[PDB]
Write an enzyme that holds these catalytic residues in place. Structure first.
Site, PDB file in Angstrom:
ATOM      1  N   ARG A  89       8.738  34.983  34.165  1.00 15.76           N
ATOM      2  CA  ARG A  89       9.028  35.178  32.682  1.00 15.76           C
ATOM      3  C   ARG A  89       8.719  36.520  32.331  1.00 15.76           C
ATOM      4  O   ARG A  89       9.357  36.998  31.324  1.00 15.76           O
ATOM      5  CB  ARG A  89       7.832  34.316  31.984  1.00 15.76           C
ATOM      6  CG  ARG A  89       8.087  32.689  31.985  1.00 15.76           C
ATOM      7  CD  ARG A  89       9.348  32.336  31.100  1.00 15.76           C
ATOM      8  NE  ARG A  89       9.392  30.914  31.011  1.00 15.76           N
ATOM      9  CZ  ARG A  89      10.554  30.067  30.508  1.00 15.76           C
ATOM     10  NH1 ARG A  89      11.637  31.134  30.381  1.00 15.76           N
ATOM     11  NH2 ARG A  89      10.545  28.827  30.375  1.00 15.76           N
ATOM     12  N   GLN A 172      -1.479  30.437  13.317  1.00 16.70           N
ATOM     13  CA  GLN A 172      -1.072  31.360  12.390  1.00 16.70           C
ATOM     14  C   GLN A 172      -2.443  32.528  12.541  1.00 16.70           C
ATOM     15  O   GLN A 172      -2.372  33.807  12.442  1.00 16.70           O
ATOM     16  CB  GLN A 172      -1.290  30.965  11.062  1.00 16.70           C
ATOM     17  CG  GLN A 172      -0.644  31.876  10.019  1.00 16.70           C
ATOM     18  CD  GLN A 172      -0.962  31.490   8.557  1.00 16.70           C
ATOM     19  OE1 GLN A 172      -1.341  30.236   8.408  1.00 16.70           O
ATOM     20  NE2 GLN A 172      -0.565  32.225   7.738  1.00 16.70           N
ATOM     21  N   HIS A 176      -1.746  36.330  14.149  1.00 12.11           N
ATOM     22  CA  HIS A 176      -1.771  37.225  13.064  1.00 12.11           C
ATOM     23  C   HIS A 176      -2.654  38.439  13.675  1.00 12.11           C
ATOM     24  O   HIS A 176      -2.863  39.348  12.530  1.00 12.11           O
ATOM     25  CB  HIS A 176      -2.332  36.725  11.749  1.00 12.11           C
ATOM     26  CG  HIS A 176      -1.650  36.478  10.695  1.00 12.11           C
ATOM     27  ND1 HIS A 176      -0.126  36.527  10.778  1.00 12.11           N
ATOM     28  CD2 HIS A 176      -1.611  36.217   9.307  1.00 12.11           C
ATOM     29  CE1 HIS A 176       0.291  36.399   9.714  1.00 12.11           C
ATOM     30  NE2 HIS A 176      -0.735  36.173   8.786  1.00 12.11           N
ATOM     31  N   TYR A 324       4.565  20.321  29.183  1.00 15.51           N
ATOM     32  CA  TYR A 324       4.861  20.149  30.673  1.00 15.51           C
ATOM     33  C   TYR A 324       3.725  19.321  31.234  1.00 15.51           C
ATOM     34  O   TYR A 324       2.427  19.262  30.496  1.00 15.51           O
ATOM     35  CB  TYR A 324       4.594  21.544  31.492  1.00 15.51           C
ATOM     36  CG  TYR A 324       5.817  22.743  31.073  1.00 15.51           C
ATOM     37  CD1 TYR A 324       6.731  22.160  30.353  1.00 15.51           C
ATOM     38  CD2 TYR A 324       5.672  24.100  31.119  1.00 15.51           C
ATOM     39  CE1 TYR A 324       7.878  23.045  29.908  1.00 15.51           C
ATOM     40  CE2 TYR A 324       6.396  24.882  31.020  1.00 15.51           C
ATOM     41  CZ  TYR A 324       7.734  24.528  30.319  1.00 15.51           C
ATOM     42  OH  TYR A 324       8.638  25.263  30.080  1.00 15.51           O
ATOM     43  N   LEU A 353      11.025  35.231  15.739  1.00 22.12           N
ATOM     44  CA  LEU A 353      10.943  33.708  16.274  1.00 22.12           C
ATOM     45  C   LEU A 353       9.587  33.063  15.823  1.00 22.12           C
ATOM     46  O   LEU A 353       9.600  31.611  15.806  1.00 22.12           O
ATOM     47  CB  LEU A 353      11.237  33.613  17.715  1.00 22.12           C
ATOM     48  CG  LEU A 353      10.254  34.281  18.680  1.00 22.12           C
ATOM     49  CD1 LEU A 353       9.106  33.056  19.305  1.00 22.12           C
ATOM     50  CD2 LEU A 353      11.264  34.808  20.043  1.00 22.12           C
ATOM     51  N   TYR A 354       8.658  33.710  15.621  1.00 19.61           N
ATOM     52  CA  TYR A 354       7.136  33.076  15.435  1.00 19.61           C
ATOM     53  C   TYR A 354       7.050  32.625  13.857  1.00 19.61           C
ATOM     54  O   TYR A 354       5.794  32.197  13.423  1.00 19.61           O
ATOM     55  CB  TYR A 354       6.167  33.815  15.806  1.00 19.61           C
ATOM     56  CG  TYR A 354       5.143  33.143  16.914  1.00 19.61           C
ATOM     57  CD1 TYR A 354       4.263  32.120  16.551  1.00 19.61           C
ATOM     58  CD2 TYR A 354       5.196  33.539  18.389  1.00 19.61           C
ATOM     59  CE1 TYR A 354       3.522  31.398  17.278  1.00 19.61           C
ATOM     60  CE2 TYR A 354       4.321  32.919  19.004  1.00 19.61           C
ATOM     61  CZ  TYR A 354       3.488  32.027  18.546  1.00 19.61           C
ATOM     62  OH  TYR A 354       2.619  31.407  19.475  1.00 19.61           O
ATOM     63  N   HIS A 357       7.795  28.344   9.851  1.00 19.02           N
ATOM     64  CA  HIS A 357       7.664  27.708   8.472  1.00 19.02           C
ATOM     65  C   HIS A 357       7.750  26.133   8.177  1.00 19.02           C
ATOM     66  O   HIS A 357       6.861  25.920   7.595  1.00 19.02           O
ATOM     67  CB  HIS A 357       8.520  28.472   7.474  1.00 19.02           C
ATOM     68  CG  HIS A 357       8.412  30.150   7.414  1.00 19.02           C
ATOM     69  ND1 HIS A 357       9.598  30.680   8.058  1.00 19.02           N
ATOM     70  CD2 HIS A 357       7.389  30.618   6.946  1.00 19.02           C
ATOM     71  CE1 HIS A 357       9.025  32.136   7.678  1.00 19.02           C
ATOM     72  NE2 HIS A 357       8.000  31.927   7.164  1.00 19.02           N
ATOM     73  N   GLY A 495      10.717  32.775  23.338  1.00 20.56           N
ATOM     74  CA  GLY A 495       9.425  32.820  22.934  1.00 20.56           C
ATOM     75  C   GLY A 495       8.375  33.052  24.310  1.00 20.56           C
ATOM     76  O   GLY A 495       7.218  33.552  24.278  1.00 20.56           O
ATOM     77  N   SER A 499       5.528  35.825  25.188  1.00 18.63           N
ATOM     78  CA  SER A 499       3.852  35.097  25.007  1.00 18.63           C
ATOM     79  C   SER A 499       3.207  35.597  26.055  1.00 18.63           C
ATOM     80  O   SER A 499       2.136  35.761  26.013  1.00 18.63           O
ATOM     81  CB  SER A 499       3.937  33.575  24.702  1.00 18.63           C
ATOM     82  OG  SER A 499       2.921  33.078  24.459  1.00 18.63           O
TER      83      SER A 499
HETATM   84  C1  LIG Z   1      10.349  23.545  39.155  1.00 21.37           C
HETATM   85  C2  LIG Z   1       9.283  24.271  39.663  1.00 21.37           C
HETATM   86  C3  LIG Z   1       8.495  25.013  38.539  1.00 21.37           C
HETATM   87  C4  LIG Z   1       9.441  25.904  37.958  1.00 21.37           C
HETATM   88  C5  LIG Z   1       8.703  26.708  36.712  1.00 21.37           C
HETATM   89  C6  LIG Z   1       9.766  27.768  36.086  1.00 21.37           C
HETATM   90  C7  LIG Z   1       9.512  27.774  34.677  1.00 21.37           C
HETATM   91  C8  LIG Z   1      10.232  28.852  34.031  1.00 21.37           C
HETATM   92  O1  LIG Z   1      11.336  29.250  34.795  1.00 21.37           O
HETATM   93  C9  LIG Z   1      12.467  29.882  33.994  1.00 21.37           C
HETATM   94  O2  LIG Z   1      13.408  29.227  34.531  1.00 21.37           O
HETATM   95  C10 LIG Z   1      14.573  29.815  33.690  1.00 21.37           C
HETATM   96  C11 LIG Z   1      15.810  29.049  34.015  1.00 21.37           C
HETATM   97  O3  LIG Z   1      15.815  28.900  35.408  1.00 21.37           O
HETATM   98  C12 LIG Z   1      14.948  31.117  33.822  1.00 21.37           C
HETATM   99  O4  LIG Z   1      15.907  31.685  33.244  1.00 21.37           O
HETATM  100  C13 LIG Z   1      13.842  31.896  33.501  1.00 21.37           C
HETATM  101  O5  LIG Z   1      13.961  33.294  34.371  1.00 21.37           O
HETATM  102  C14 LIG Z   1      12.472  31.568  34.338  1.00 21.37           C
HETATM  103  O6  LIG Z   1      11.488  32.068  33.779  1.00 21.37           O
HETATM  104  C1  LIG Z   2       7.475  29.467  22.967  1.00 21.83           C
HETATM  105  C2  LIG Z   2       6.205  30.067  23.205  1.00 21.83           C
HETATM  106  C3  LIG Z   2       5.983  30.704  21.928  1.00 21.83           C
HETATM  107  C4  LIG Z   2       5.293  28.973  23.529  1.00 21.83           C
HETATM  108  C5  LIG Z   2       5.596  28.920  25.059  1.00 21.83           C
HETATM  109  C6  LIG Z   2       5.956  27.751  25.510  1.00 21.83           C
HETATM  110  C7  LIG Z   2       6.080  27.375  26.575  1.00 21.83           C
HETATM  111  C8  LIG Z   2       5.641  28.246  27.819  1.00 21.83           C
HETATM  112  C9  LIG Z   2       5.899  28.001  29.270  1.00 21.83           C
HETATM  113  C10 LIG Z   2       4.586  28.193  29.855  1.00 21.83           C
HETATM  114  C11 LIG Z   2       6.935  28.610  29.926  1.00 21.83           C
HETATM  115  O1  LIG Z   2       6.799  29.762  30.122  1.00 21.83           O
HETATM  116  O2  LIG Z   2       8.015  27.794  30.253  1.00 21.83           O
HETATM  117  C12 LIG Z   2       5.217  29.581  27.257  1.00 21.83           C
HETATM  118  C13 LIG Z   2       4.907  29.706  26.010  1.00 21.83           C
END
Ligand SMILES: CCCCCCCCO[C@@H]1O[C@H](CO)[C@@H](O)[C@H](O)[C@H]1O
Ligand SMILES: CC(C)Cc1ccc([C@H](C)C(=O)O)cc1
Ligand SMILES: *[C@@H]1O[C@H](CO)[C@@H](O[C@@H]2O[C@H](CO)[C@@H](O)[C@H](O)[C@H]2NC(C)=O)[C@H](O)[C@H]1NC(C)=O
Ligand SMILES: *[C@@H]1O[C@H](CO)[C@@H](O[C@@H]2O[C@H](CO)[C@@H](O)[C@H](O)[C@H]2NC(C)=O)[C@H](O)[C@H]1NC(C)=O
Ligand SMILES: CCCCCCCCO[C@@H]1O[C@H](CO)[C@@H](O)[C@H](O)[C@H]1O
Ligand SMILES: CC(C)Cc1ccc([C@H](C)C(=O)O)cc1
Ligand SMILES: *[C@@H]1O[C@H](CO)[C@@H](O)[C@H](O)[C@H]1NC(C)=O
Ligand SMILES: *[C@@H]1O[C@H](CO)[C@@H](O)[C@H](O)[C@H]1NC(C)=O
Ligand SMILES: *[C@@H]1O[C@H](CO)[C@@H](O)[C@H](O)[C@H]1NC(C)=O
Ligand SMILES: *[C@@H]1O[C@H](CO)[C@@H](O)[C@H](O)[C@H]1NC(C)=O
Lengths: 557, 557
Positions: A89, A172, A176, A324, A353-354, A357, A495, A499
């Site tokens: 991420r 919020q 903030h 998840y 994006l946050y 509303h 996001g 985040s």
């Molecule tokens: C299935 C085993 C756990 C995997 C957790 C990864 C969740 C976030 O994985 C995301 O996958 C996306 C699609 O592949 C990519 O585009 C992002 O770079 C990656 O952060």
């Molecule tokens: C959209 C964001 C503001 C909230 C958000 C939602 C899901 C995840 C998970 C851990 C991920 O990275 O896939 C992180 C942060």
């Protein structure tokens, strides 16, 4: 005029003009080469074959609950997965930061000037023919029309994931502290020069405001007791600036870190809980260190509350929001053998994006009262009449609105929603599909693929004509949601990088900081590593009421 | 009173009080355990056996010239060595930063408040019995006595390494961009909120000052031409604040980035050279990009000059100062597969050790003139009379003073040298041996081991009694120099981590920045990667005079 207006460079290659009508793409470390960085290197097209789509990954993460129950109880395996989540991420975020609203090229002004929000994508140059570069008409469709046709709420649409008002107000209150737009300068500027989780909304942005809020005894913040329970001090007793309408009583002018937290009783609730939590940690530390003075007690407590916040946001807030079955983990140790920059700059696109509303309900329900927006705003007497315990009980069971899906923005805040569209255009945001490609998503080939339906898609096509001209913010709200989810694909894939990077990029997560002595010993350290949204309410709210970010959660006994 | 006053924790373990008369050491990731972090882990005592002393490494690096000639021409091997130099030196620096003058514990105030110099070692607590903790007498010896007995110059002692005034003035010009002590607040505070190489001494600390200095055409800075050669603009034409005595003519009030650069003609020389260099790069960029405006031309040129500076400081300045036969290399790519934080906070101890007052000569010799300190100060007319070409010719051949070895501080600046001692005590610096241990050096067991002689050692023992009470700054100046070198062991082993970390911790060294497009294409990029102190003077000084940081270097033809 600018030959880069068409955004020709792909796969995060950088565009540079080489004359009046020519450009060149810098494909350095992109994994691609060629005029537009579209020809894959050998190792790249291999990774491209193995890499699963974001929707595929989302499915696996929100299904096979039995398998994840096994994974969650294997510490080495849980650590391995969470490590990959953090690193994958974070890689999507530029750190050190680059562009801002005034710089489509890298410059020292863009880097050093902390008053700017940074930008995940450079702004469209001023001398471009169309607002989105070269595509679309000379003007974007009327923002008021976009708002009324696909954004405004005809009837409340509840969140399928069950997010309650404990969630909505936490969201919020929490964000903030780094979403403090400086409207004197413009929408591209911020007052949160910490650019992250520094808890300035509790302690104040400046040192002057911090000292007005402090008691200078036992490291505690100033407080008052009303009806046996603790509340923030008054404006009168502290002289800090708060934003209250002139008709508010002296006793009800609560003084907290953030000056706009008097706006909503929901915000003042969390302001009160964290205030109690700070002073709670102070006494615990004073117990361990009778030799410590006021200053070290205050500072150490602030570090602990920062840790608590990140712990809660990851393992409760994001955990619920993600949907998840994999049990997320706040463990700074996971990044100690990885490449990671312990710094962060708040992106303007993160702020945009946050703007959830649609989260807001039609009325705010406490006990058997149905307060309207008119009645709720700036009414801290509502908080004193019912108390925090009553607030927690009621808000835990009141459901919030679905963010994606469209037509769910409450009409009471239509001006704020319209502002989000206008300011988005004023800051020269690139199109939706450009941001999707930026975060490794396939562009939408039609408005129907975006909304997943026909009626709203048709309204948008009449307004925008081309899908490659569709704006980011209104797309996020009308986007086809994941099955039984609160968000669409774009909201999560944009996001999540912002985040998670903002949470782990904190200095207390760095190896030199992440140790018991930093937090006053093993006792202080344990406060962080055992923190939760339930324990926060349990320790600081009368009666230790049950709480959760999900209305669907059953209350025991 | 404070149980940590004795500095009980070893090997960078952190000390925390656990009661009024008890402490505990945090040995996390130190490689040691036990009450004082002195018992080695198995893998640790192995590394301890193999690790060569700093003096052993110094010998190998300054001898075997034939072997290094082979190594220098093997790119993969040269890259491997330089990579190890960067990473091993950087590991000694805390990043993100921790302590400052007001915080012996980690706090958010110490981290976020950029007005502080950070601290490599926490200050001695206020309630300690003695200035250095528990050892020594209630008061440190008279600073005036220390100054006169072992620091003041009886006769000029030249630098064996041959450092000239081109070096001495470069050192003062370069480091004055991140050594800007805010004396309104105190010696522990700074005005350089960039905390590194941002070239604010050229462009100004604030945006207001930057705009007064700019021409707003072709991205250039304002200038004037006197006698066919280019010089900085006047205070009159720019309205920027400079520090000049009231008797200085209007035409001679030069306006540059740093306000104190009018103090010395030597500083104004480099201020002029870099001014010409900026405008030189501007025209080169305008050549490549006729479509660019003033803003992008200015910003891109600033990035290039930042690159040039780091390139020159590493491959010329530090190269000469190190005395190594190994050819150092400025290559940000070396750290791309390593763990490294692209950020930096200027340490107070870095500022202190860089007070190389013995560098200054008795007189400043230009042509056949022997200007004194009285005549040289604030006299920019000296610069116009002789010109830069004459300055370079003369300063290349005038040798500077030996920093270590003792008794070489010119009497004209005895007040400044005394201030360095007093302010060092005011900021509650720990002892010399504590800083030596901090940077992996064996403590000195006697004053004779420190000075390498008898006479000065005896004077110091009469003043300090205990070697474990000897202060850092005066030790650096009296320390036994390495054979035929300008510095002792402590100056190098402390200075090198701070220096290299500050250079590579720059954002332009980060992967997202280090690419041709950042610097306006391959042409701009090449300006950085081919930069040198000779080419800087050659391109911007009339006649392209020969120059070097070493008087010993023969001039060809
Ligand atoms: C299935 C085993 C756990 C995997 C957790 C990864 C969740 C976030 O994985 C995301 O996958 C996306 C699609 O592949 C990519 O585009 C992002 O770079 C990656 O952060
Ligand atoms: C959209 C964001 C503001 C909230 C958000 C939602 C899901 C995840 C998970 C851990 C991920 O990275 O896939 C992180 C942060
Ligand atoms: C950072 O950027 C802002 C925005 O450009 C700068 O604020 C400007 O300051 C100048 C004078 O310094 C004013 O004339 C402008 O009106 C300001 N603009 C805005 C939008 O407020 C600021 O000076 C920059 N530097 C720092 C250190 O903040
Ligand atoms: C950073 O630290 C300095 C030093 O403590 C702070 O400056 C003090 O500010 C208060 C009021 O804010 C004054 O009463 C003191 O006189 C100041 N002290 C000194 C030594 O100047 C500063 O406010 C802190 N915060 C920031 C953002 O700079
Ligand atoms: C001999 C091959 C080149 C070695 C270059 C290393 C130069 C700097 O190496 C230094 O060595 C010191 C003593 O071992 C250590 O204390 C420092 O941590 C390390 O930076
Ligand atoms: C003392 C410091 C200010 C100058 C200096 C001297 C030598 C070195 C070499 C590269 C090293 O790290 O061993 C770096 C910096
Ligand atoms: C690169 O993009 C431009 C327009 O965006 C297009 O005309 C050109 O054919 C592309 N080049 C390649 C090699 O695909
Ligand atoms: C605030 O709430 C109280 C009840 O707690 C109510 O009496 C009052 O009218 C409200 N104020 C406004 C402005 O709605
Ligand atoms: C630790 O240091 C203290 C004083 O600094 C000393 O009295 C004690 O014996 C030391 N402990 C060990 C295990 O060496
Ligand atoms: C400055 O130098 C000039 C010669 O260039 C000399 O005439 C003048 O007296 C000097 N000024 C001072 C104050 O020494």
């Amino acid at each position: 005029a600018n030959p880069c207006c068409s955004n020709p460079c792909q796969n995060r290659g950088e565009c540079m003009s080489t004359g009046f009508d020519q450009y060149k793409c810098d494909c350095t470390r992109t994994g691609f080469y060629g005029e537009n960085c579209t020809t894959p290197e050998f190792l790249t097209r291999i990774k491209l074959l193995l890499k699963p789509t974001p929707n595929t990954v989302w499915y696996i993460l929100t299904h096979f609950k039995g398998v994840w129950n096994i994974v969650n109880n294997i510490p080495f395996l849980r650590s391995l997965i969470m490590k990959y989540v953090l690193t994958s991420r974070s890689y999507l975020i530029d750190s050190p930061p680059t562009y801002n609203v005034h710089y489509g090229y890298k410059s020292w002004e863009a880097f050093s000037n902390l008053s700017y929000y940074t930008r995940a994508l450079p702004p469209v140059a001023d001398d471009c023919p169309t607002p989105m570069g070269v595509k679309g008409n000379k003007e974007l469709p009327d923002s008021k029309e976009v708002l009324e046709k696909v954004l405004l709420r005809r009837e409340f649409i509840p969140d399928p994931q069950g997010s309650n008002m404990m969630f909505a107000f936490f969201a919020q209150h929490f964000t903030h502290q780094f979403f403090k737009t400086d409207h004197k300068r413009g929408p591209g500027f911020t007052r949160g020069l910490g650019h992250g989780v520094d808890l300035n909304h509790i302690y104040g942005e400046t040192l002057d405001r911090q000292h007005k809020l402090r008691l200078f005894k036992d490291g505690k913040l100033k407080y008052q007791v009303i009806g046996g329970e603790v509340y923030p001090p008054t404006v009168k007793d502290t002289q800090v600036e708060m934003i209250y309408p002139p008709h508010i009583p002296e006793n009800l002018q609560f003084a907290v870190g953030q000056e706009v937290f008097g706006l909503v009783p929901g915000l003042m609730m969390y302001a009160t809980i964290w205030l109690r939590e700070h002073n709670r940690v102070c006494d615990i530390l004073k117990q361990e260190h009778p030799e410590w003075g006021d200053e070290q007690l205050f500072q150490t407590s602030r570090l602990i509350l920062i840790g608590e916040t990140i712990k809660i946001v990851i393992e409760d807030y994001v955990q619920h929001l993600s949907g998840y079955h994999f049990k997320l983990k706040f463990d700074p140790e996971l990044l100690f053998n990885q490449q990671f920059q312990y710094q962060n700059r708040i992106a303007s696109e993160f702020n945009t994006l946050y703007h959830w509303h649609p989260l807001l309900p039609d009325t705010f329900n406490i006990e058997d009262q149905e307060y309207s927006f008119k009645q709720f705003l700036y009414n801290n007497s509502i908080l004193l009449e019912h108390g925090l315990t009553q607030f927690v009980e009621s808000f835990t069971r009141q459901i919030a609105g679905r963010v994606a899906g469209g037509r769910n923005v409450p009409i009471a805040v239509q001006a704020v929603a319209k502002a989000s569209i206008d300011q988005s255009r004023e800051m020269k945001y690139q199109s939706l599909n450009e941001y999707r490609k930026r975060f490794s998503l396939k562009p939408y080939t039609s408005f129907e693929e975006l909304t997943g339906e026909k009626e709203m898609a048709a309204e948008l096509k009449a307004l925008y004509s081309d899908i490659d001209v569709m704006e980011l913010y209104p797309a996020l709200l009308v986007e086809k949601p994941r099955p039984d989810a609160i968000f669409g694909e774009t909201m999560v894939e944009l996001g999540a990088p912002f985040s998670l990077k903002g949470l782990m990029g904190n200095p207390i997560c760095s190896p030199q900081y992440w140790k018991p002595s930093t937090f006053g010993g093993e006792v202080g350290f344990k406060i962080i590593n055992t923190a939760s949204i339930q324990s926060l309410i349990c320790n600081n709210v009368k009666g230790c009421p049950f709480t959760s970010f999900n209305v669907q959660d059953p209350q025991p006994t």
